[PDB]
Design a protein around this motif. Structure first.
Motif, PDB file in Angstrom:
ATOM      1  N   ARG A 147       2.711 -13.793 -18.216  1.00  0.00           N
ATOM      2  CA  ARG A 147       3.589 -14.813 -18.762  1.00  0.00           C
ATOM      3  C   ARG A 147       5.048 -14.539 -18.419  1.00  0.00           C
ATOM      4  N   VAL A 148       5.851 -15.602 -18.357  1.00  0.00           N
ATOM      5  CA  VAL A 148       7.256 -15.530 -17.980  1.00  0.00           C
ATOM      6  C   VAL A 148       8.129 -16.377 -18.910  1.00  0.00           C
ATOM      7  N   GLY A 149       9.196 -15.768 -19.412  1.00  0.00           N
ATOM      8  CA  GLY A 149      10.109 -16.394 -20.372  1.00  0.00           C
ATOM      9  C   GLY A 149      11.344 -15.518 -20.487  1.00  0.00           C
ATOM     10  N   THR A 150      11.429 -14.540 -19.571  1.00  0.00           N
ATOM     11  CA  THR A 150      12.681 -13.855 -19.241  1.00  0.00           C
ATOM     12  C   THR A 150      13.355 -14.690 -18.141  1.00  0.00           C
ATOM     13  N   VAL A 184       8.399 -23.266 -27.608  1.00  0.00           N
ATOM     14  CA  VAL A 184       8.132 -22.657 -26.306  1.00  0.00           C
ATOM     15  C   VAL A 184       8.806 -21.291 -26.235  1.00  0.00           C
ATOM     16  N   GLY A 185       8.044 -20.289 -25.780  1.00  0.00           N
ATOM     17  CA  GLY A 185       8.535 -18.925 -25.581  1.00  0.00           C
ATOM     18  C   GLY A 185       8.337 -18.469 -24.144  1.00  0.00           C
ATOM     19  N   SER A 186       7.272 -18.954 -23.514  1.00  0.00           N
ATOM     20  CA  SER A 186       6.925 -18.487 -22.181  1.00  0.00           C
ATOM     21  C   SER A 186       6.014 -19.462 -21.433  1.00  0.00           C
ATOM     22  N   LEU A 187       5.834 -19.202 -20.137  1.00  0.00           N
ATOM     23  CA  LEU A 187       4.979 -19.982 -19.254  1.00  0.00           C
ATOM     24  C   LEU A 187       3.857 -19.108 -18.715  1.00  0.00           C
ATOM     25  N   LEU A 188       2.717 -19.710 -18.415  1.00  0.00           N
ATOM     26  CA  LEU A 188       1.570 -18.955 -17.945  1.00  0.00           C
ATOM     27  C   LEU A 188       1.407 -19.085 -16.443  1.00  0.00           C
TER      28      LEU A 188
END
Ligand code: CL
Ligand code: CL
Ligand code: MG
Ligand code: ZN
Ligand code: ZN
Length: 299
Positions: A218-221, A200-204
């Motif tokens: 996308r969010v993963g910060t 997993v790196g990010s969410l949509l």
């Protein structure tokens, strides 16, 4: 000109990048109490943004009126209590005690020594305001240099929340929210629906619309590799056989994707929207379990 008829002019929520200095003046956007101030040859009267007479709440602004005692003026501005970084703060104002220093940051002049200025254009009102500032101890924060983007970056460097851009040709419209004043904060907040995750790196993220979710980026910060593994665990119960998006995702974003049912709302921090409905500089602010996807709306 009736001072107890006046209410503040108001800013429109919007974007300042791309605005040109030749048309727009760029002011810093601070948190405090908006105040109209009458300083009549030594005497002071104060109105809150809702028109209440708050004269007695700020005895310390009497010194301002005495300093301006050569003049009869009506000023628009912000009563402010600074934090330890020197930046106006809402909670410092909220927690104000009898002895805490309140500053008045002036940013408009509505009346000067017999002359009413509502019909005068910003450029000219501003020039007079500066004259007052240079001849007395009135605090008039400076304008930000450059075009929209540069001014925005300056504001950031001051630790300030954002910019209010005001049209140089514009008049003062008491009580009105006007398109000639545009307010823009560095950081903003948006609710989103999670439509999937990616390697997993990010969410949509998406916004509900006709035919499904409109893809928001996308969010993963705002999170690390441990926290990402957790979200993968939490979200598995919700795998789906239909994409929740109205329209195929772009190719970059489609690679290594797992769709989930569009059941969950998150809050995210972000800078601005992109022309194609995406959220720039997303960071994670947590799931919001009691919120309904169906009431997620572009705020
Ligand atoms: Cl406003
Ligand atoms: Cl919250
Ligand atoms: Mg009257
Ligand atoms: Zn604010
Ligand atoms: Zn919130």
């Amino acid at each position: 000109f009736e001072f107890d008829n006046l209410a503040p002019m108001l800013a429109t929520h919007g974007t300042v990048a791309g605005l040109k200095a030749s048309q727009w003046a760029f002011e810093g956007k601070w948190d405090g109490y908006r105040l109209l101030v009458e300083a009549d040859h030594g005497a002071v009267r104060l109105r809150s943004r809702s028109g209440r007479d708050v004269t007695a709440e700020y005895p310390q602004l009497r010194a301002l009126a005495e300093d301006l005692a050569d003049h009869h003026v009506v000023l628009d501005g912000e009563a402010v209590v600074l934090d330890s970084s020197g930046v106006p703060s809402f909670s410092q104002m909220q927690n104000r005690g009898r002895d805490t220093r309140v500053e008045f940051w002036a940013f408009d002049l509505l009346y000067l020594d017999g002359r009413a200025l509502l019909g005068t254009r910003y450029q000219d009102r501003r020039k007079l305001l500066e004259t007052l500032a240079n001849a007395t101890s009135l605090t008039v924060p400076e304008l930000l240099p450059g075009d929209g983007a540069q001014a925005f970056a300056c504001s950031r460097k001051h630790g300030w929340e954002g910019v209010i851009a005001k049209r140089r040709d514009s008049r003062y419209q008491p009580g009105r929210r006007c398109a000639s004043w545009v307010k823009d904060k560095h950081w903003n907040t948006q609710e989103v629906v999670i439509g999937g995750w990616r390697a997993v790196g990010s969410l949509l993220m998406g916004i509900p619309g006709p035919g499904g979710l409109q893809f928001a980026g996308r969010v993963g910060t705002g999170l690390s590799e441990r926290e990402l593994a957790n979200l993968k665990e939490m979200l598995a119960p919700l795998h789906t056989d239909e994409s929740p998006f109205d329209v195929p995702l772009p190719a970059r974003d489609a690679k290594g994707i797992t769709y989930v049912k569009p059941a969950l709302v998150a809050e995210v921090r972000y800078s601005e929207w992109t022309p194609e409905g995406r959220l720039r500089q997303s960071s994670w602010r947590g799931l919001r379990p009691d919120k309904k996807p169906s009431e997620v709306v572009r705020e």
